[PDB]
Amino acid sequence: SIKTPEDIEKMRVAGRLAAEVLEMIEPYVKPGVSTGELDRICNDYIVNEQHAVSACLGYHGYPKSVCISINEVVCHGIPDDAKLLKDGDIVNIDVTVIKDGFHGDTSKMFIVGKPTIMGERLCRITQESLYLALRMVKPGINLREIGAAIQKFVEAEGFSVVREYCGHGIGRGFHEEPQVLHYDSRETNVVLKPGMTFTIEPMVNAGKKEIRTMKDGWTVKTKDRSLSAQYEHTIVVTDNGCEILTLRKDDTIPAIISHDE
Ligand SMILES: CCCC[C@H](N)P(=O)(O)O
Ligand SMILES: [Mn+2]
Ligand SMILES: [Mn+2]
Ligand code: NA
């Protein structure tokens, strides 16, 4: 759908809150901390300080407030008091906040303690693939072209793109049309128009693209157990580009990307 200026302003607020959760949790992602504790810190912040709520809790039965995925886990990892972070781990924390009826969805990678060279490379390439897609967003571009670009870059850098999960429209609804694939698919044909709001959240594996879902129905891992990384941002298509609604201080790309001269 096409969001109104009123809707977009509310999404700026929700997106900003989601981003602030990631900025707040940063110092706590240390060796020895449990993912269960990280989840409580995030939830307490969202509820008590932001006066908002997690869109994850209860969604199709999801049991926690945020998703925390470690190493070979591709996405939707479930916070657990018994799971402790250790040196070398690459960790994704995915946050989705609802404020004033609108959603803000974002995630980033954190490397615990001493980074491994391939771990850093995978995360760097993954974020760059997101940035590349963000710089392409503007009315007239087709989602298929964006997906194709992400895939071309990821594969050119020696990695693979997860196919089963994708970005999505977002607003008063957690997931709305359209589907935002991170690869080139014949199924995709969506010409971007100003007012559209959606997420881009590429999942990149160091090894092969195939994944597997655990018995809990949420935890997704790489079939070959290789590392997997992901970064996500929520955006709105503007008259001549896009505006990132979940930008953080550590992002190295501006919030407004205009293609004007
Ligand atoms: C509880 C479900 C988690 C939803 C994730 N934010 P995404 O839709 O970005 O994978
Ligand atoms: Mn997310
Ligand atoms: Mn999402
Ligand atoms: Na991972």
mmCIF file of C-alpha atoms and ligand atoms in Angstrom:
data_model
loop_
_atom_site.group_PDB
_atom_site.id
_atom_site.type_symbol
_atom_site.label_atom_id
_atom_site.label_comp_id
_atom_site.label_asym_id
_atom_site.label_seq_id
_atom_site.Cartn_x
_atom_site.Cartn_y
_atom_site.Cartn_z
ATOM 1 C CA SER A 1 0.000 0.000 0.000
ATOM 2 C CA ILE A 2 0.879 3.688 -0.137
ATOM 3 C CA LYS A 3 1.492 5.371 3.226
ATOM 4 C CA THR A 4 0.298 8.912 3.932
ATOM 5 C CA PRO A 5 2.569 11.614 5.384
ATOM 6 C CA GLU A 6 0.852 10.943 8.719
ATOM 7 C CA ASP A 7 1.591 7.212 8.492
ATOM 8 C CA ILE A 8 5.187 7.873 7.486
ATOM 9 C CA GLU A 9 5.809 10.162 10.462
ATOM 10 C CA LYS A 10 4.586 7.444 12.831
ATOM 11 C CA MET A 11 6.888 4.975 11.103
ATOM 12 C CA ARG A 12 9.802 7.356 11.622
ATOM 13 C CA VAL A 13 9.055 7.185 15.337
ATOM 14 C CA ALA A 14 8.650 3.397 15.460
ATOM 15 C CA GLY A 15 11.745 2.877 13.324
ATOM 16 C CA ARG A 16 13.783 5.226 15.495
ATOM 17 C CA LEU A 17 12.742 3.323 18.615
ATOM 18 C CA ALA A 18 13.731 0.002 17.042
ATOM 19 C CA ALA A 19 17.118 1.463 16.134
ATOM 20 C CA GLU A 20 17.615 2.871 19.625
ATOM 21 C CA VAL A 21 17.122 -0.609 21.092
ATOM 22 C CA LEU A 22 20.096 -1.827 19.028
ATOM 23 C CA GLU A 23 22.167 1.185 20.065
ATOM 24 C CA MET A 24 21.269 0.520 23.707
ATOM 25 C CA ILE A 25 21.997 -3.222 23.753
ATOM 26 C CA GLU A 26 25.450 -2.867 22.115
ATOM 27 C CA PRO A 27 27.577 -2.669 25.305
ATOM 28 C CA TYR A 28 25.840 -5.724 26.785
ATOM 29 C CA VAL A 29 26.745 -8.101 23.936
ATOM 30 C CA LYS A 30 29.840 -9.477 25.668
ATOM 31 C CA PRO A 31 31.415 -12.898 26.289
ATOM 32 C CA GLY A 32 29.579 -14.585 29.158
ATOM 33 C CA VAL A 33 26.193 -12.898 28.732
ATOM 34 C CA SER A 34 23.184 -15.086 27.984
ATOM 35 C CA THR A 35 20.871 -14.384 25.063
ATOM 36 C CA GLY A 36 18.019 -14.718 27.529
ATOM 37 C CA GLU A 37 19.404 -11.773 29.492
ATOM 38 C CA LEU A 38 19.896 -9.714 26.336
ATOM 39 C CA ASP A 39 16.229 -10.342 25.520
ATOM 40 C CA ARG A 40 15.107 -9.145 28.963
ATOM 41 C CA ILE A 41 17.223 -5.998 28.706
ATOM 42 C CA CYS A 42 15.721 -5.228 25.302
ATOM 43 C CA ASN A 43 12.155 -5.919 26.399
ATOM 44 C CA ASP A 44 12.427 -3.907 29.608
ATOM 45 C CA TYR A 45 13.804 -0.991 27.589
ATOM 46 C CA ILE A 46 11.027 -1.166 24.995
ATOM 47 C CA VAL A 47 8.226 -1.426 27.564
ATOM 48 C CA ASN A 48 9.460 0.684 30.479
ATOM 49 C CA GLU A 49 11.399 3.426 28.713
ATOM 50 C CA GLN A 50 10.088 3.609 25.146
ATOM 51 C CA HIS A 51 6.553 2.837 26.315
ATOM 52 C CA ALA A 52 6.113 0.637 23.252
ATOM 53 C CA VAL A 53 5.836 -3.116 22.712
ATOM 54 C CA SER A 54 7.603 -5.926 20.864
ATOM 55 C CA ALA A 55 5.818 -7.118 17.726
ATOM 56 C CA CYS A 56 7.643 -10.442 18.063
ATOM 57 C CA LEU A 57 6.017 -11.630 21.284
ATOM 58 C CA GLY A 58 3.078 -13.894 20.537
ATOM 59 C CA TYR A 59 3.492 -13.538 16.772
ATOM 60 C CA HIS A 60 2.440 -16.983 15.583
ATOM 61 C CA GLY A 61 3.374 -18.013 19.100
ATOM 62 C CA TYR A 62 6.916 -16.605 19.181
ATOM 63 C CA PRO A 63 7.945 -16.831 22.891
ATOM 64 C CA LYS A 64 10.417 -13.949 23.275
ATOM 65 C CA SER A 65 10.688 -10.198 22.598
ATOM 66 C CA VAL A 66 13.570 -10.113 20.128
ATOM 67 C CA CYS A 67 15.251 -12.663 17.867
ATOM 68 C CA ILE A 68 18.881 -13.493 18.590
ATOM 69 C CA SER A 69 20.782 -15.624 16.082
ATOM 70 C CA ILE A 70 24.319 -16.924 16.612
ATOM 71 C CA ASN A 71 26.858 -18.145 14.043
ATOM 72 C CA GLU A 72 25.305 -20.897 11.877
ATOM 73 C CA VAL A 73 21.830 -19.776 12.920
ATOM 74 C CA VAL A 74 20.374 -17.842 9.983
ATOM 75 C CA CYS A 75 17.435 -16.175 11.696
ATOM 76 C CA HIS A 76 14.723 -16.319 14.334
ATOM 77 C CA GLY A 77 16.993 -17.709 17.037
ATOM 78 C CA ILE A 78 15.208 -17.822 20.386
ATOM 79 C CA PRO A 79 16.749 -16.090 23.446
ATOM 80 C CA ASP A 80 17.709 -18.586 26.154
ATOM 81 C CA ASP A 81 19.115 -18.139 29.666
ATOM 82 C CA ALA A 82 21.442 -21.108 29.151
ATOM 83 C CA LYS A 83 23.002 -19.872 25.907
ATOM 84 C CA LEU A 84 26.130 -17.837 26.637
ATOM 85 C CA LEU A 85 28.073 -15.764 24.125
ATOM 86 C CA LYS A 86 31.778 -16.504 23.674
ATOM 87 C CA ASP A 87 34.784 -15.098 21.832
ATOM 88 C CA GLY A 88 34.440 -15.155 18.063
ATOM 89 C CA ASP A 89 30.652 -15.479 17.919
ATOM 90 C CA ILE A 90 28.830 -13.385 15.341
ATOM 91 C CA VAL A 91 25.416 -12.443 16.670
ATOM 92 C CA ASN A 92 22.360 -10.905 15.088
ATOM 93 C CA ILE A 93 19.774 -9.178 17.238
ATOM 94 C CA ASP A 94 16.550 -8.502 15.366
ATOM 95 C CA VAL A 95 14.211 -5.946 16.912
ATOM 96 C CA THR A 96 10.644 -5.087 15.965
ATOM 97 C CA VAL A 97 8.817 -2.415 17.942
ATOM 98 C CA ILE A 98 5.223 -1.241 17.654
ATOM 99 C CA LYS A 99 4.566 2.385 18.590
ATOM 100 C CA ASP A 100 1.370 4.337 17.952
ATOM 101 C CA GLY A 101 0.128 1.427 15.852
ATOM 102 C CA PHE A 102 3.102 1.266 13.487
ATOM 103 C CA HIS A 103 6.048 -1.124 13.196
ATOM 104 C CA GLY A 104 9.794 -0.521 13.076
ATOM 105 C CA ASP A 105 11.900 -3.556 12.093
ATOM 106 C CA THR A 106 15.700 -3.677 12.144
ATOM 107 C CA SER A 107 18.679 -5.899 12.939
ATOM 108 C CA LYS A 108 22.468 -5.785 12.971
ATOM 109 C CA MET A 109 25.445 -8.037 13.596
ATOM 110 C CA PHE A 110 27.682 -7.891 16.665
ATOM 111 C CA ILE A 111 30.964 -9.766 16.924
ATOM 112 C CA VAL A 112 31.817 -11.035 20.403
ATOM 113 C CA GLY A 113 35.302 -10.565 21.817
ATOM 114 C CA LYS A 114 38.132 -11.400 19.433
ATOM 115 C CA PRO A 115 36.733 -11.398 15.879
ATOM 116 C CA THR A 116 37.586 -14.135 13.388
ATOM 117 C CA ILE A 117 38.720 -12.884 9.979
ATOM 118 C CA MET A 118 36.001 -14.703 8.027
ATOM 119 C CA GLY A 119 33.399 -13.650 10.571
ATOM 120 C CA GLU A 120 34.276 -9.998 10.048
ATOM 121 C CA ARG A 121 34.351 -10.442 6.276
ATOM 122 C CA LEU A 122 30.939 -12.118 6.179
ATOM 123 C CA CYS A 123 29.386 -9.348 8.270
ATOM 124 C CA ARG A 124 31.032 -6.602 6.209
ATOM 125 C CA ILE A 125 29.839 -8.062 2.902
ATOM 126 C CA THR A 126 26.344 -8.621 4.273
ATOM 127 C CA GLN A 127 25.988 -5.017 5.403
ATOM 128 C CA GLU A 128 27.384 -3.749 2.093
ATOM 129 C CA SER A 129 24.843 -5.832 0.185
ATOM 130 C CA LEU A 130 22.114 -4.096 2.195
ATOM 131 C CA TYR A 131 23.658 -0.673 1.531
ATOM 132 C CA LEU A 132 23.892 -1.442 -2.190
ATOM 133 C CA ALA A 133 20.181 -2.235 -2.259
ATOM 134 C CA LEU A 134 19.364 0.908 -0.283
ATOM 135 C CA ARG A 135 21.227 3.126 -2.772
ATOM 136 C CA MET A 136 19.117 1.662 -5.612
ATOM 137 C CA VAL A 137 15.706 2.351 -4.083
ATOM 138 C CA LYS A 138 13.699 4.982 -5.942
ATOM 139 C CA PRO A 139 10.407 5.138 -7.861
ATOM 140 C CA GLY A 140 10.612 3.196 -11.114
ATOM 141 C CA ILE A 141 13.076 0.531 -9.997
ATOM 142 C CA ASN A 142 11.709 -3.013 -9.882
ATOM 143 C CA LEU A 143 12.129 -5.147 -6.764
ATOM 144 C CA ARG A 144 13.467 -7.880 -9.030
ATOM 145 C CA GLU A 145 16.367 -5.619 -10.021
ATOM 146 C CA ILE A 146 17.177 -4.941 -6.369
ATOM 147 C CA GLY A 147 17.086 -8.647 -5.601
ATOM 148 C CA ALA A 148 19.299 -9.350 -8.604
ATOM 149 C CA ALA A 149 21.811 -6.712 -7.507
ATOM 150 C CA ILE A 150 22.086 -8.079 -3.971
ATOM 151 C CA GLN A 151 22.631 -11.605 -5.277
ATOM 152 C CA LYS A 152 25.191 -10.554 -7.900
ATOM 153 C CA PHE A 153 27.236 -8.716 -5.279
ATOM 154 C CA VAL A 154 27.013 -11.411 -2.595
ATOM 155 C CA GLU A 155 28.021 -14.167 -5.006
ATOM 156 C CA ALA A 156 30.778 -12.034 -6.546
ATOM 157 C CA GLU A 157 32.229 -11.743 -3.041
ATOM 158 C CA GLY A 158 32.263 -15.512 -2.536
ATOM 159 C CA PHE A 159 29.120 -15.985 -0.434
ATOM 160 C CA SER A 160 25.529 -17.205 -0.882
ATOM 161 C CA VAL A 161 22.051 -15.711 -0.397
ATOM 162 C CA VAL A 162 19.283 -17.393 1.613
ATOM 163 C CA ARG A 163 16.175 -17.808 -0.549
ATOM 164 C CA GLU A 164 13.464 -18.957 1.891
ATOM 165 C CA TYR A 165 13.311 -15.747 3.901
ATOM 166 C CA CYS A 166 12.932 -12.198 2.636
ATOM 167 C CA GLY A 167 12.188 -8.550 3.278
ATOM 168 C CA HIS A 168 8.603 -7.333 3.481
ATOM 169 C CA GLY A 169 6.182 -4.445 3.337
ATOM 170 C CA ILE A 170 5.519 -3.013 6.793
ATOM 171 C CA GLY A 171 3.222 -0.503 8.484
ATOM 172 C CA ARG A 172 0.278 -1.082 10.792
ATOM 173 C CA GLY A 173 1.007 -4.696 9.889
ATOM 174 C CA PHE A 174 4.197 -6.599 10.793
ATOM 175 C CA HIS A 175 4.498 -8.175 7.347
ATOM 176 C CA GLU A 176 2.617 -6.666 4.414
ATOM 177 C CA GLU A 177 2.954 -6.747 0.650
ATOM 178 C CA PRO A 178 5.224 -6.699 -1.147
ATOM 179 C CA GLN A 179 7.647 -9.582 -0.762
ATOM 180 C CA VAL A 180 11.246 -8.320 -0.918
ATOM 181 C CA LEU A 181 13.460 -11.131 -2.190
ATOM 182 C CA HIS A 182 17.230 -10.780 -1.908
ATOM 183 C CA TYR A 183 17.865 -12.631 -5.174
ATOM 184 C CA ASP A 184 16.635 -12.573 -8.777
ATOM 185 C CA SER A 185 13.345 -14.449 -9.137
ATOM 186 C CA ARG A 186 11.036 -14.783 -12.136
ATOM 187 C CA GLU A 187 8.162 -14.488 -9.651
ATOM 188 C CA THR A 188 9.068 -10.880 -8.876
ATOM 189 C CA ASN A 189 7.641 -7.866 -10.701
ATOM 190 C CA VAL A 190 7.013 -4.826 -8.517
ATOM 191 C CA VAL A 191 7.678 -1.281 -9.719
ATOM 192 C CA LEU A 192 8.474 0.937 -6.746
ATOM 193 C CA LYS A 193 6.272 3.957 -6.094
ATOM 194 C CA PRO A 194 6.674 6.745 -3.516
ATOM 195 C CA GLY A 195 4.919 6.052 -0.228
ATOM 196 C CA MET A 196 5.707 2.343 -0.167
ATOM 197 C CA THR A 197 7.310 1.181 3.073
ATOM 198 C CA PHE A 198 9.207 -2.081 3.393
ATOM 199 C CA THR A 199 12.283 -3.814 4.759
ATOM 200 C CA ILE A 200 15.436 -5.172 3.157
ATOM 201 C CA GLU A 201 17.150 -7.819 5.273
ATOM 202 C CA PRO A 202 19.585 -10.035 3.368
ATOM 203 C CA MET A 203 20.757 -13.242 5.033
ATOM 204 C CA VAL A 204 24.139 -14.311 3.676
ATOM 205 C CA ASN A 205 25.868 -17.643 4.262
ATOM 206 C CA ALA A 206 29.625 -18.119 4.156
ATOM 207 C CA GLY A 207 29.008 -21.517 2.580
ATOM 208 C CA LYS A 208 26.045 -22.840 0.577
ATOM 209 C CA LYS A 209 22.586 -21.257 0.431
ATOM 210 C CA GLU A 210 20.572 -24.232 1.721
ATOM 211 C CA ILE A 211 18.972 -23.953 5.156
ATOM 212 C CA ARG A 212 17.195 -26.184 7.657
ATOM 213 C CA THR A 213 14.541 -25.470 10.266
ATOM 214 C CA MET A 214 14.804 -26.853 13.788
ATOM 215 C CA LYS A 215 12.016 -28.641 15.645
ATOM 216 C CA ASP A 216 10.982 -25.497 17.535
ATOM 217 C CA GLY A 217 9.612 -24.213 14.236
ATOM 218 C CA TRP A 218 11.548 -20.947 14.417
ATOM 219 C CA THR A 219 15.300 -21.528 14.557
ATOM 220 C CA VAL A 220 16.747 -21.652 11.037
ATOM 221 C CA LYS A 221 20.320 -22.878 10.461
ATOM 222 C CA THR A 222 22.587 -23.282 7.443
ATOM 223 C CA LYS A 223 22.347 -26.836 6.129
ATOM 224 C CA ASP A 224 26.154 -27.026 5.903
ATOM 225 C CA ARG A 225 26.586 -25.362 9.307
ATOM 226 C CA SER A 226 28.535 -22.461 7.797
ATOM 227 C CA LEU A 227 28.252 -18.979 9.310
ATOM 228 C CA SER A 228 25.319 -16.770 8.339
ATOM 229 C CA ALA A 229 24.926 -13.015 8.765
ATOM 230 C CA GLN A 230 22.102 -10.512 8.385
ATOM 231 C CA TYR A 231 21.384 -6.770 8.595
ATOM 232 C CA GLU A 232 17.963 -5.166 8.213
ATOM 233 C CA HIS A 233 16.546 -1.680 7.769
ATOM 234 C CA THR A 234 13.011 -0.374 7.305
ATOM 235 C CA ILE A 235 12.568 2.283 4.631
ATOM 236 C CA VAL A 236 10.036 4.430 2.825
ATOM 237 C CA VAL A 237 10.301 5.128 -0.894
ATOM 238 C CA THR A 238 10.446 8.876 -1.510
ATOM 239 C CA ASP A 239 9.736 10.867 -4.682
ATOM 240 C CA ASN A 240 13.339 10.417 -5.831
ATOM 241 C CA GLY A 241 14.934 7.783 -3.613
ATOM 242 C CA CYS A 242 14.355 6.471 -0.111
ATOM 243 C CA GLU A 243 14.549 7.331 3.552
ATOM 244 C CA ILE A 244 15.947 4.867 6.076
ATOM 245 C CA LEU A 245 13.712 4.899 9.143
ATOM 246 C CA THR A 246 15.903 2.698 11.330
ATOM 247 C CA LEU A 247 19.292 4.386 10.908
ATOM 248 C CA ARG A 248 21.819 4.137 13.757
ATOM 249 C CA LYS A 249 24.829 6.248 14.708
ATOM 250 C CA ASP A 250 27.122 3.431 13.543
ATOM 251 C CA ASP A 251 25.556 3.197 10.074
ATOM 252 C CA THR A 252 27.920 4.568 7.421
ATOM 253 C CA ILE A 253 25.213 5.668 5.008
ATOM 254 C CA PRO A 254 22.937 8.720 5.393
ATOM 255 C CA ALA A 255 19.255 8.354 6.285
ATOM 256 C CA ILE A 256 18.022 10.138 3.177
ATOM 257 C CA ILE A 257 19.271 8.856 -0.165
ATOM 258 C CA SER A 258 18.087 11.165 -2.928
ATOM 259 C CA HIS A 259 18.912 10.630 -6.599
ATOM 260 C CA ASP A 260 18.457 14.289 -7.531
ATOM 261 C CA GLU A 261 21.123 16.609 -8.907
HETATM 262 C C1 LIG B 1 9.098 -13.269 15.584
HETATM 263 C C2 LIG B 1 9.314 -13.236 14.073
HETATM 264 C C3 LIG B 1 10.532 -12.367 13.763
HETATM 265 C C4 LIG B 1 10.223 -11.468 12.571
HETATM 266 C C5 LIG B 1 11.505 -10.787 12.097
HETATM 267 N N1 LIG B 1 11.560 -9.398 12.582
HETATM 268 P P1 LIG B 1 11.631 -10.835 10.283
HETATM 269 O O1 LIG B 1 10.287 -10.798 9.667
HETATM 270 O O2 LIG B 1 12.490 -9.575 9.786
HETATM 271 O O3 LIG B 1 12.384 -12.186 9.848
HETATM 272 MN MN MN B 2 13.463 -8.191 11.716
HETATM 273 MN MN MN B 3 11.770 -7.956 8.913
HETATM 274 NA NA NA B 4 24.220 -16.371 12.036
#
